[PDB]
Amino acid sequence: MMLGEHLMSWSKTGIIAYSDSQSSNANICLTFLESINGINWRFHTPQKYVLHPQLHEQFFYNISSIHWNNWFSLPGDMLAVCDELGNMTMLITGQRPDRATTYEKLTMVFQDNKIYNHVMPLKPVDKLKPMNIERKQTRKEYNTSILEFRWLTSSKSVIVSQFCAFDSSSNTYRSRAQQVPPYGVYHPPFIKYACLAIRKNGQIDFWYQFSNSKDHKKITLQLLDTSNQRFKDLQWLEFARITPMNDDQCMLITTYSKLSKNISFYKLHVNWNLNDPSLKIQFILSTTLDPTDDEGHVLKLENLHVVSKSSIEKDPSPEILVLYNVCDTSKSLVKRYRLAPTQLSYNLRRHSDIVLDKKVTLITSEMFDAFVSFYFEDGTIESYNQNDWKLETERLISQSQLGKFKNIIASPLSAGFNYGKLPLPPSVEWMKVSPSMCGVIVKQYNKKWPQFYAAVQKNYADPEKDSINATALAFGYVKSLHKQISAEDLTIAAKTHILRISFLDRKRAKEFITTLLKSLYSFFNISPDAPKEIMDKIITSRPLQKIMLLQLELGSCFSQENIEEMARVILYLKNVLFAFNGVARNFHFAIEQISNNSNQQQNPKLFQTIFSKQDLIHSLIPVAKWFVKFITYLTQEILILINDPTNKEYTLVHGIFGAKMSRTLILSILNEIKKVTQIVAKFPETSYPILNESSTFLKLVLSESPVDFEKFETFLVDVNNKFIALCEQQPSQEREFSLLVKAEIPPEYAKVGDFL
Amino acid sequence: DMKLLRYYKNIWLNNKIINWEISNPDFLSKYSAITSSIFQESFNSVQNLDQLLTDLIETSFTCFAQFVSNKQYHQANSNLTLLERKWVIFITKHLPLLILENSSRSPRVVTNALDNIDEKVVKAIRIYFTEKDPSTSLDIRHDFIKGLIMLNLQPASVINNYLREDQMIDTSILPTRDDLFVRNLQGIQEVVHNTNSFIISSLDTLELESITESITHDSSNGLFQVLHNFESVAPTKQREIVKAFLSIFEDAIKELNYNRIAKICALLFFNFSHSLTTILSFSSPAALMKTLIKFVDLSRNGRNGSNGNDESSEYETINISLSFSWAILLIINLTQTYGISVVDVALKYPELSIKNSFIINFISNLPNVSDKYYLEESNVNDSDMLTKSHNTVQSWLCDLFVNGSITDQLIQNIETRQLANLIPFIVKQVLLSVEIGVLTDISSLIGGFEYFLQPLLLVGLIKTFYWLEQFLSCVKNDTISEDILQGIFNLLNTLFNPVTLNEDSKAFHTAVLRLNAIPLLKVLRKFNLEPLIAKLVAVLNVSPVYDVDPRIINSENDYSRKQLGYGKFLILNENPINKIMTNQINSFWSLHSSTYYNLDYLFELIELVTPKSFLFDVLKTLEYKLATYGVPGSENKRGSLDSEHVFDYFFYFLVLYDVKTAEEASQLIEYMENNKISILKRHSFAVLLHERKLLNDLALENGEITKTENEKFISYHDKYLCMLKTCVF
């Protein structure tokens, strides 16, 4: 039997919403990955919910498919689930009718049965009282049973990367990123969202919402637009795969109706332009399937998966991969067809045939990766690339090394990281390869919790392969950030390999981290050895919230080590940065509001405005206590290190001062602190003396600090000048990495350490 | 026990009638052994011959009763009549012979058999006939007795016993002798003492023009009169006539007699008065297929020993071309309407080269034509033939569209197989060019398409009509101006309504238009238009068409306020797939509704839902009904033996849908106990059950499945084998 290709959906924000078929009080579950003790990981507690057609005011039905709106560049928060009865239930997470909420709390938009608006925040089943709802099983495949659900993207563009190659001239890996223009059908901004669903009887649906209204509208048609309803209700489509094509506002509805035993093709057209969009349909082509192979073995169509192909590839015609299995033979044939117009001097052109040695039980297409996954019977997975259908795990062995571009790598799977012995599909409810292909999710019958399997490498004792592996995992994150993926799956896989390295040689594992994170900067065209102008851009960059988090997890096992400590203090300084300069801009605008709003004193709006002015500065006081408490720790270590310079356990103090933007960042914090105090002194609170306590306390805490800020200000300023002249004395770029990440000084610069 | 016996026997007879196994001399043996096979315990009763024939009589009558009385619950247009005609043919033809050489000629036993029937069958038959329509309304019982009279089984005084008390039948008028009588040219009923000589003598003097234009029955040819009067042939004589064709046809293949091969195929294709259906009723279609596909495959060696240097060559080449071209049309008609597969026969007979079979891959790609022209398909890796492949295209286009004549050199140098694909290529190029606007001159083309109707080029029309609907379906949705549209009809009408036809091409042209007429009519009506439908309806009325709504053919003025259904199986929203299968669940579990015993409406339903979803949605849904309601027919919820027989109803039905012949069963037992076996049964349940049995056993070694779950699945599997081994198929 075919597996649950759409039973589970990994939302782009990490929420794992999957169908539930065992609990008698719930049909859907929500969970996510969390860290146990910084080293290990565990799934979050399942948040069970119950979905029935009568939430608007009682038996609930099973869930057919779950589709997170993670397609293209969509935010990925609006989850629309279609049940077995055909009702499309839309749930929005991260929002409440009155306020904003976290990502684990759900909310309804509208229910379909006729469509009506009813906003209501859902509640978990466990917290809710025992209700009179029983699991009624809709074991009937209705005319309205949705076969395939597809989302509609907006006019925004997505920028991703295609592949990277090893530049032997510079002995470094180089990657190029190509912008991907939108292709297929996209909804305009004035429409809040749109979606399309194909029902098993051929009836089509088009839900959409106007951005300026709350009422929802639905437009429905039927594929077979014949004059007789006798054939209208006959199109029982076995497979209905919708692949958008480069044609404007066109979707190729590749259907296989067993009534006529032909793979019929269709074309759907929509005119966006507030009038309702118009829907049109036009029949195109129909072909019959091949009965036999070349040698005389008959074939059976197991699956019909057509790839969503953009205009980037050489031939944009979608690949209709009609799978065939030779009976009583381990072989499995995948014939490939392409749809092309008929040219004068449409039609399906056959390119070639590909033979696989094991039977296939599931096919899943990766998103923004162009990878077809063949989940064979024995559990092994062979992901064939869309470009050449060359096996990714064995591409390096068979790659033609000679050429301008060598060692073409697209994913960590190219290095050789193969999954272990996965559980057999008969015991498995559903599988899904993780977005980065680093691991596979397996749900088990007797396991109440989801499992997880990571990739392993057999030749971990060979030291010469560390250069390639670090670069391969470096590019894995490059694609993830461009697609706004959490990439929590990739983080787990990297740590396991590092842990096995550290068990034999602890010294070797440390260098693996340094080389791995270095390639990230080269891939993203960001240089820590650049002039100071780019350095300001680095601090505000989102990646440091994640690339620094990498060593926060990859260095957790190393007790009493400063690799994670160096990243955390810089990361927390960013939080410290958001505290003062986050409100320094806000406080500056409050100065102008005082003068222009001084003509109405008795109004009931100024009194709340006046109260809020002096309340905001009060909340900064607890932050300032940790701000002073932080600078004392580094000054305390100065006295300790002088007596015993040979103590390696206190090498964190070197990296903190060595960081180039941190010295400027603290100076900027000290600059705005002076500006704020000068402004407060220039513009004090006079109407209410009682409110001056917060303003006065701000002056007192600075003066009463055990160490004067002015003396400490000159401390970091002098370090910057001395560390710049040393660069001119001898050119070196590794010292920039050493002062920022390694938190150490190379032995070749041992004289520099004595100066501190 | 009796209910189990009757259900098993009715399904067994239905399956065996569908499977064309009546001609098997093991029918009586299997029918007698049914009673012993059903009951596991020994049942050693000496059943006398009269008992067997009586049991057969009431079984057949009750089966026909259920078959005709279950039809009102079907959709009014879900029309499938092959099995209805099959029941009629069996009951009127074989059962009289079964009595003739199986009975002891006892008039009493027939009276007891036909007096023990319930009046419900008679009431239902009369009600259905009255609703369809005093006018003479004869039942199937009258035809049964009439056949027995001709065989000297019963005296003429027996028919009056069962006649209505007010109406008798004159004894003298009823025929009593089994001798063949034919109306000669002078009106005297001549006695055909010898059958084989009559066929060959008429066949030699037969005219191919007399096929469709001879609407009147007063034709000088005796054999042609028989086809239009096929419903009144004697019981025992028609077996000789069917066997006469087989021996003659096989001898014509051995001697390579091209004249009589082409003529024979023309008679069988058109199926006047259900002539072709009776043929498949006797001779097994497998043996008919084997010889027929041998000719179309072994004809390659026959063209390397003939030299075109005689004035009889053009006579021979036309005779060769028509003999080969007609033999293709016989296969397509059998595959499409009669539900036979060309792939299956190759697997069963090892002497057929599957990889080198041109017929096998031709049928499966019949409605689709390649955009590129290749002289040979197995050697696409070579470029030498592709150089002259384009030469052939331009050589034929210039000679036929500009020169206006077909040179004899072109015909001699090319084979029939290349012609079968060359003609669709050229017509597609010309028709596409006309539609776009590349070709603007019609009159030269109208004459140009006339050259496609010559006897030499007749085989090229087979693929021309199939492509038309795919061409027309795009045309129907696309916006085409009437000036172009009227041109399309003008070019099309040349093939549809020729000005003149040769004496060997007139019957062929009608025959090809008859294969793929039905989908063409549906597309055309969606829009010089009328003549095409008028021609299409004319060729559709020459003989009856199976599984077609009669209202569609004659919808010129009838408006019944009900939309027409062109397909065999039709579904509405008022009666969706849910309601019928929910009624199937009521029948799969409680044997309710009335759609059972109708393998016409059920076999197609299974395919429309696939065996996987069909079995998945019923096996696990049974538990919900069983856990709440309980086993029907028992007032006590004690024991599992009562539920055991209910499970036997479901598993016995699935066995017949998988096993189709006698020796096949002996080979499926070896498939379970563990290549060629599962090839023929790709979609069988047995393959699905066995493939999961081995797969989950692998997980048992690896221990990802609980032992209880594995034990449950094998319980279904062993039950399937247990009934398979204890019952003879």
PDB file of N, CA and C in Angstrom, chain A residues 1-2 137 139-143 227-231 233-234 236 238 258-259 283-284 287 291 294 298-300 325 327-328 342 347 421 424 427, chain B residues 75 355 364 368 371 474 477 563-564 566-567 569 571-573 576-578 581 604 607-608 610 612 620-621 624 675 678 682-683 692 695 702 704-705:
ATOM      1  N   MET A   1       0.824  -1.202   0.000  1.00  0.00           N
ATOM      2  CA  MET A   1       0.000   0.000   0.000  1.00  0.00           C
ATOM      3  C   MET A   1       0.861   1.256   0.000  1.00  0.00           C
ATOM      4  N   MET A   2       0.355   2.317  -0.626  1.00  0.00           N
ATOM      5  CA  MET A   2       1.085   3.575  -0.676  1.00  0.00           C
ATOM      6  C   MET A   2       1.136   4.220   0.703  1.00  0.00           C
ATOM      7  N   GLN A 137     -15.480   7.306  11.749  1.00  0.00           N
ATOM      8  CA  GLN A 137     -14.588   7.042  10.628  1.00  0.00           C
ATOM      9  C   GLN A 137     -15.356   7.200   9.322  1.00  0.00           C
ATOM     10  N   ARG A 139     -15.162   6.238   6.128  1.00  0.00           N
ATOM     11  CA  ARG A 139     -14.499   5.247   5.288  1.00  0.00           C
ATOM     12  C   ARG A 139     -14.942   5.314   3.833  1.00  0.00           C
ATOM     13  N   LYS A 140     -15.569   6.410   3.415  1.00  0.00           N
ATOM     14  CA  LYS A 140     -16.077   6.565   2.061  1.00  0.00           C
ATOM     15  C   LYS A 140     -15.316   7.677   1.352  1.00  0.00           C
ATOM     16  N   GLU A 141     -14.889   7.405   0.117  1.00  0.00           N
ATOM     17  CA  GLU A 141     -14.173   8.384  -0.699  1.00  0.00           C
ATOM     18  C   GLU A 141     -15.202   9.185  -1.488  1.00  0.00           C
ATOM     19  N   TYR A 142     -15.567  10.350  -0.964  1.00  0.00           N
ATOM     20  CA  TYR A 142     -16.636  11.162  -1.521  1.00  0.00           C
ATOM     21  C   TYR A 142     -16.183  11.878  -2.790  1.00  0.00           C
ATOM     22  N   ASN A 143     -17.169  12.408  -3.521  1.00  0.00           N
ATOM     23  CA  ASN A 143     -16.875  13.255  -4.671  1.00  0.00           C
ATOM     24  C   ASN A 143     -15.999  14.436  -4.280  1.00  0.00           C
ATOM     25  N   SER A 227     -21.731  18.671 -21.742  1.00  0.00           N
ATOM     26  CA  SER A 227     -23.122  19.085 -21.625  1.00  0.00           C
ATOM     27  C   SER A 227     -23.953  18.137 -20.770  1.00  0.00           C
ATOM     28  N   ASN A 228     -23.409  16.989 -20.382  1.00  0.00           N
ATOM     29  CA  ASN A 228     -24.150  15.973 -19.643  1.00  0.00           C
ATOM     30  C   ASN A 228     -23.549  15.810 -18.253  1.00  0.00           C
ATOM     31  N   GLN A 229     -24.406  15.851 -17.228  1.00  0.00           N
ATOM     32  CA  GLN A 229     -23.965  15.554 -15.869  1.00  0.00           C
ATOM     33  C   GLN A 229     -23.670  14.075 -15.662  1.00  0.00           C
ATOM     34  N   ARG A 230     -24.037  13.220 -16.622  1.00  0.00           N
ATOM     35  CA  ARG A 230     -23.730  11.798 -16.515  1.00  0.00           C
ATOM     36  C   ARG A 230     -22.230  11.548 -16.489  1.00  0.00           C
ATOM     37  N   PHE A 231     -21.470  12.287 -17.301  1.00  0.00           N
ATOM     38  CA  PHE A 231     -20.016  12.190 -17.306  1.00  0.00           C
ATOM     39  C   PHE A 231     -19.340  13.203 -16.395  1.00  0.00           C
ATOM     40  N   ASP A 233     -19.877  13.602 -13.194  1.00  0.00           N
ATOM     41  CA  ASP A 233     -19.642  12.948 -11.915  1.00  0.00           C
ATOM     42  C   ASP A 233     -18.976  11.584 -12.075  1.00  0.00           C
ATOM     43  N   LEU A 234     -18.196  11.400 -13.141  1.00  0.00           N
ATOM     44  CA  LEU A 234     -17.553  10.125 -13.417  1.00  0.00           C
ATOM     45  C   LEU A 234     -16.041  10.149 -13.281  1.00  0.00           C
ATOM     46  N   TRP A 236     -13.222   9.790 -11.765  1.00  0.00           N
ATOM     47  CA  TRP A 236     -12.573   9.296 -10.549  1.00  0.00           C
ATOM     48  C   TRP A 236     -11.076   9.218 -10.805  1.00  0.00           C
ATOM     49  N   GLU A 238      -7.347   8.710 -10.277  1.00  0.00           N
ATOM     50  CA  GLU A 238      -6.453   7.974  -9.390  1.00  0.00           C
ATOM     51  C   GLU A 238      -5.323   8.859  -8.886  1.00  0.00           C
ATOM     52  N   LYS A 258      -8.685   6.064 -14.609  1.00  0.00           N
ATOM     53  CA  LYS A 258      -8.756   4.655 -14.980  1.00  0.00           C
ATOM     54  C   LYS A 258     -10.002   4.318 -15.788  1.00  0.00           C
ATOM     55  N   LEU A 259     -10.960   5.241 -15.894  1.00  0.00           N
ATOM     56  CA  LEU A 259     -12.126   4.999 -16.738  1.00  0.00           C
ATOM     57  C   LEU A 259     -11.727   4.876 -18.203  1.00  0.00           C
ATOM     58  N   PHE A 283      -8.603  21.466 -22.317  1.00  0.00           N
ATOM     59  CA  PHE A 283      -8.015  20.144 -22.505  1.00  0.00           C
ATOM     60  C   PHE A 283      -6.882  20.207 -23.522  1.00  0.00           C
ATOM     61  N   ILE A 284      -5.839  19.405 -23.300  1.00  0.00           N
ATOM     62  CA  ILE A 284      -4.642  19.490 -24.132  1.00  0.00           C
ATOM     63  C   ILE A 284      -4.289  18.159 -24.786  1.00  0.00           C
ATOM     64  N   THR A 287      -2.421  10.354 -23.437  1.00  0.00           N
ATOM     65  CA  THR A 287      -1.583   9.284 -23.959  1.00  0.00           C
ATOM     66  C   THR A 287      -1.807   8.003 -23.166  1.00  0.00           C
ATOM     67  N   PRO A 291       2.936  -1.158 -22.303  1.00  0.00           N
ATOM     68  CA  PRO A 291       2.636  -2.416 -21.611  1.00  0.00           C
ATOM     69  C   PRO A 291       3.857  -3.259 -21.269  1.00  0.00           C
ATOM     70  N   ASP A 294      11.745  -3.669 -23.175  1.00  0.00           N
ATOM     71  CA  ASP A 294      12.440  -4.071 -24.394  1.00  0.00           C
ATOM     72  C   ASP A 294      12.653  -5.580 -24.451  1.00  0.00           C
ATOM     73  N   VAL A 298       6.448  -7.493 -18.724  1.00  0.00           N
ATOM     74  CA  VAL A 298       5.344  -6.542 -18.667  1.00  0.00           C
ATOM     75  C   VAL A 298       5.522  -5.604 -17.476  1.00  0.00           C
ATOM     76  N   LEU A 299       4.813  -4.478 -17.527  1.00  0.00           N
ATOM     77  CA  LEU A 299       4.980  -3.407 -16.558  1.00  0.00           C
ATOM     78  C   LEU A 299       3.636  -3.031 -15.948  1.00  0.00           C
ATOM     79  N   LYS A 300       3.685  -2.540 -14.709  1.00  0.00           N
ATOM     80  CA  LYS A 300       2.517  -2.030 -14.006  1.00  0.00           C
ATOM     81  C   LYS A 300       2.836  -0.648 -13.459  1.00  0.00           C
ATOM     82  N   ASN A 325       7.166  -1.536 -12.333  1.00  0.00           N
ATOM     83  CA  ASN A 325       7.883  -2.618 -11.675  1.00  0.00           C
ATOM     84  C   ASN A 325       7.750  -3.900 -12.488  1.00  0.00           C
ATOM     85  N   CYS A 327       7.441  -7.578 -12.714  1.00  0.00           N
ATOM     86  CA  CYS A 327       6.923  -8.506 -11.720  1.00  0.00           C
ATOM     87  C   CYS A 327       7.883  -9.671 -11.506  1.00  0.00           C
ATOM     88  N   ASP A 328       7.942 -10.140 -10.260  1.00  0.00           N
ATOM     89  CA  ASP A 328       8.822 -11.230  -9.828  1.00  0.00           C
ATOM     90  C   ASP A 328      10.293 -10.918 -10.074  1.00  0.00           C
ATOM     91  N   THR A 342       4.113  20.701 -30.426  1.00  0.00           N
ATOM     92  CA  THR A 342       4.371  20.121 -31.734  1.00  0.00           C
ATOM     93  C   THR A 342       4.840  21.210 -32.690  1.00  0.00           C
ATOM     94  N   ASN A 347       3.013  17.088 -27.819  1.00  0.00           N
ATOM     95  CA  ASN A 347       3.495  15.717 -27.892  1.00  0.00           C
ATOM     96  C   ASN A 347       4.354  15.410 -26.672  1.00  0.00           C
ATOM     97  N   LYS A 421      20.422   1.640   9.030  1.00  0.00           N
ATOM     98  CA  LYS A 421      19.370   0.661   8.759  1.00  0.00           C
ATOM     99  C   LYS A 421      18.051   1.199   9.296  1.00  0.00           C
ATOM    100  N   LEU A 424      11.682  -1.109   8.750  1.00  0.00           N
ATOM    101  CA  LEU A 424      11.034  -1.575   7.536  1.00  0.00           C
ATOM    102  C   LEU A 424       9.696  -0.855   7.340  1.00  0.00           C
ATOM    103  N   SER A 427       6.255  -1.745   9.221  1.00  0.00           N
ATOM    104  CA  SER A 427       6.048  -1.291  10.587  1.00  0.00           C
ATOM    105  C   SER A 427       5.900   0.220  10.688  1.00  0.00           C
TER     106      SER A 427
ATOM    107  N   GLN B  75     -28.121   1.826 -12.625  1.00  0.00           N
ATOM    108  CA  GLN B  75     -28.400   3.054 -13.355  1.00  0.00           C
ATOM    109  C   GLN B  75     -29.070   2.717 -14.682  1.00  0.00           C
ATOM    110  N   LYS B 355       9.422  -9.792 -27.448  1.00  0.00           N
ATOM    111  CA  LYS B 355      10.263  -8.635 -27.733  1.00  0.00           C
ATOM    112  C   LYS B 355      10.265  -8.282 -29.215  1.00  0.00           C
ATOM    113  N   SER B 364      -1.299  -1.378 -28.210  1.00  0.00           N
ATOM    114  CA  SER B 364      -1.205  -0.538 -27.024  1.00  0.00           C
ATOM    115  C   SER B 364      -0.905   0.915 -27.363  1.00  0.00           C
ATOM    116  N   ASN B 368      -2.226   6.703 -30.575  1.00  0.00           N
ATOM    117  CA  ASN B 368      -1.138   7.673 -30.563  1.00  0.00           C
ATOM    118  C   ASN B 368      -0.136   7.346 -31.659  1.00  0.00           C
ATOM    119  N   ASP B 371       5.609  11.523 -33.598  1.00  0.00           N
ATOM    120  CA  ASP B 371       5.853  12.729 -34.375  1.00  0.00           C
ATOM    121  C   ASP B 371       6.983  12.549 -35.379  1.00  0.00           C
ATOM    122  N   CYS B 474      -9.143  18.651 -28.842  1.00  0.00           N
ATOM    123  CA  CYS B 474      -8.445  19.932 -28.803  1.00  0.00           C
ATOM    124  C   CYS B 474      -9.155  20.966 -29.668  1.00  0.00           C
ATOM    125  N   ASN B 477     -12.357  22.443 -27.861  1.00  0.00           N
ATOM    126  CA  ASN B 477     -12.092  23.470 -26.859  1.00  0.00           C
ATOM    127  C   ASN B 477     -11.453  24.709 -27.471  1.00  0.00           C
ATOM    128  N   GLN B 563     -29.957  13.297 -19.489  1.00  0.00           N
ATOM    129  CA  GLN B 563     -28.690  13.429 -20.194  1.00  0.00           C
ATOM    130  C   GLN B 563     -28.134  12.062 -20.572  1.00  0.00           C
ATOM    131  N   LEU B 564     -27.552  11.983 -21.763  1.00  0.00           N
ATOM    132  CA  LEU B 564     -27.075  10.721 -22.301  1.00  0.00           C
ATOM    133  C   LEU B 564     -25.737  10.328 -21.684  1.00  0.00           C
ATOM    134  N   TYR B 566     -22.475   8.040 -22.524  1.00  0.00           N
ATOM    135  CA  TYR B 566     -21.781   7.333 -23.589  1.00  0.00           C
ATOM    136  C   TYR B 566     -20.954   6.154 -23.092  1.00  0.00           C
ATOM    137  N   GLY B 567     -20.685   6.066 -21.789  1.00  0.00           N
ATOM    138  CA  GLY B 567     -19.820   5.049 -21.240  1.00  0.00           C
ATOM    139  C   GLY B 567     -20.588   3.866 -20.666  1.00  0.00           C
ATOM    140  N   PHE B 569     -20.086   2.524 -17.661  1.00  0.00           N
ATOM    141  CA  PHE B 569     -20.343   2.750 -16.245  1.00  0.00           C
ATOM    142  C   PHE B 569     -20.483   4.245 -16.002  1.00  0.00           C
ATOM    143  N   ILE B 571     -21.997   7.554 -13.321  1.00  0.00           N
ATOM    144  CA  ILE B 571     -22.200   7.951 -11.930  1.00  0.00           C
ATOM    145  C   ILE B 571     -22.771   9.365 -11.891  1.00  0.00           C
ATOM    146  N   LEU B 572     -23.707   9.592 -10.977  1.00  0.00           N
ATOM    147  CA  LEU B 572     -24.303  10.902 -10.732  1.00  0.00           C
ATOM    148  C   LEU B 572     -23.977  11.357  -9.314  1.00  0.00           C
ATOM    149  N   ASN B 573     -24.336  12.607  -9.007  1.00  0.00           N
ATOM    150  CA  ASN B 573     -24.218  13.099  -7.639  1.00  0.00           C
ATOM    151  C   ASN B 573     -25.329  12.563  -6.747  1.00  0.00           C
ATOM    152  N   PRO B 576     -23.880   8.803  -5.813  1.00  0.00           N
ATOM    153  CA  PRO B 576     -22.424   8.875  -5.963  1.00  0.00           C
ATOM    154  C   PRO B 576     -21.755   7.529  -5.763  1.00  0.00           C
ATOM    155  N   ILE B 577     -20.423   7.494  -5.855  1.00  0.00           N
ATOM    156  CA  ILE B 577     -19.702   6.265  -5.564  1.00  0.00           C
ATOM    157  C   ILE B 577     -19.897   5.855  -4.115  1.00  0.00           C
ATOM    158  N   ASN B 578     -20.189   6.811  -3.230  1.00  0.00           N
ATOM    159  CA  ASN B 578     -20.382   6.490  -1.820  1.00  0.00           C
ATOM    160  C   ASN B 578     -21.619   5.626  -1.617  1.00  0.00           C
ATOM    161  N   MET B 581     -21.199   1.949  -2.991  1.00  0.00           N
ATOM    162  CA  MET B 581     -20.306   1.121  -2.191  1.00  0.00           C
ATOM    163  C   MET B 581     -20.778   1.007  -0.748  1.00  0.00           C
ATOM    164  N   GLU B 604     -16.096  -3.786 -13.198  1.00  0.00           N
ATOM    165  CA  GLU B 604     -15.725  -2.425 -13.572  1.00  0.00           C
ATOM    166  C   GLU B 604     -15.654  -1.514 -12.355  1.00  0.00           C
ATOM    167  N   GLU B 607     -12.254  -1.965 -10.627  1.00  0.00           N
ATOM    168  CA  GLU B 607     -11.185  -1.266 -11.331  1.00  0.00           C
ATOM    169  C   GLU B 607     -11.249   0.237 -11.084  1.00  0.00           C
ATOM    170  N   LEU B 608     -12.453   0.813 -11.106  1.00  0.00           N
ATOM    171  CA  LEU B 608     -12.596   2.248 -10.886  1.00  0.00           C
ATOM    172  C   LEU B 608     -12.149   2.668  -9.494  1.00  0.00           C
ATOM    173  N   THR B 610      -9.845   0.469  -7.756  1.00  0.00           N
ATOM    174  CA  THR B 610      -8.619  -0.322  -7.636  1.00  0.00           C
ATOM    175  C   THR B 610      -8.779  -1.399  -6.570  1.00  0.00           C
ATOM    176  N   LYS B 612      -6.773  -2.403  -4.322  1.00  0.00           N
ATOM    177  CA  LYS B 612      -6.238  -1.985  -3.031  1.00  0.00           C
ATOM    178  C   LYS B 612      -7.297  -1.256  -2.208  1.00  0.00           C
ATOM    179  N   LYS B 620     -11.200  -3.639   6.886  1.00  0.00           N
ATOM    180  CA  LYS B 620     -11.107  -2.992   8.186  1.00  0.00           C
ATOM    181  C   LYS B 620     -12.415  -2.333   8.614  1.00  0.00           C
ATOM    182  N   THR B 621     -13.318  -2.048   7.674  1.00  0.00           N
ATOM    183  CA  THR B 621     -14.637  -1.542   8.029  1.00  0.00           C
ATOM    184  C   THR B 621     -15.571  -2.652   8.498  1.00  0.00           C
ATOM    185  N   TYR B 624     -15.964  -2.811  12.442  1.00  0.00           N
ATOM    186  CA  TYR B 624     -16.876  -1.853  13.058  1.00  0.00           C
ATOM    187  C   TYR B 624     -18.315  -2.351  13.015  1.00  0.00           C
ATOM    188  N   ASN B 675       8.171 -17.216 -11.438  1.00  0.00           N
ATOM    189  CA  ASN B 675       8.324 -16.001 -12.229  1.00  0.00           C
ATOM    190  C   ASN B 675       7.166 -15.837 -13.209  1.00  0.00           C
ATOM    191  N   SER B 678       3.063 -14.878 -11.739  1.00  0.00           N
ATOM    192  CA  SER B 678       2.548 -13.562 -11.379  1.00  0.00           C
ATOM    193  C   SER B 678       2.563 -12.576 -12.541  1.00  0.00           C
ATOM    194  N   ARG B 682      -0.957  -9.542 -12.583  1.00  0.00           N
ATOM    195  CA  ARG B 682      -0.369  -8.374 -11.934  1.00  0.00           C
ATOM    196  C   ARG B 682      -1.338  -7.726 -10.949  1.00  0.00           C
ATOM    197  N   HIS B 683      -2.620  -7.662 -11.302  1.00  0.00           N
ATOM    198  CA  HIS B 683      -3.615  -6.965 -10.497  1.00  0.00           C
ATOM    199  C   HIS B 683      -4.412  -7.902  -9.594  1.00  0.00           C
ATOM    200  N   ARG B 692       2.946  -8.850   0.714  1.00  0.00           N
ATOM    201  CA  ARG B 692       2.982  -8.350   2.082  1.00  0.00           C
ATOM    202  C   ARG B 692       3.380  -9.440   3.070  1.00  0.00           C
ATOM    203  N   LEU B 695       7.185  -9.557   3.080  1.00  0.00           N
ATOM    204  CA  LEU B 695       7.785  -8.319   3.569  1.00  0.00           C
ATOM    205  C   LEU B 695       7.686  -8.206   5.085  1.00  0.00           C
ATOM    206  N   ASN B 702      13.869  -8.748  12.077  1.00  0.00           N
ATOM    207  CA  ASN B 702      14.391  -7.500  12.623  1.00  0.00           C
ATOM    208  C   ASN B 702      13.591  -6.991  13.816  1.00  0.00           C
ATOM    209  N   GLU B 704      10.598  -5.203  14.281  1.00  0.00           N
ATOM    210  CA  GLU B 704       9.919  -3.917  14.349  1.00  0.00           C
ATOM    211  C   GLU B 704       8.404  -4.053  14.439  1.00  0.00           C
ATOM    212  N   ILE B 705       7.877  -5.276  14.415  1.00  0.00           N
ATOM    213  CA  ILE B 705       6.439  -5.521  14.450  1.00  0.00           C
ATOM    214  C   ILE B 705       6.141  -6.490  15.586  1.00  0.00           C
TER     215      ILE B 705
END
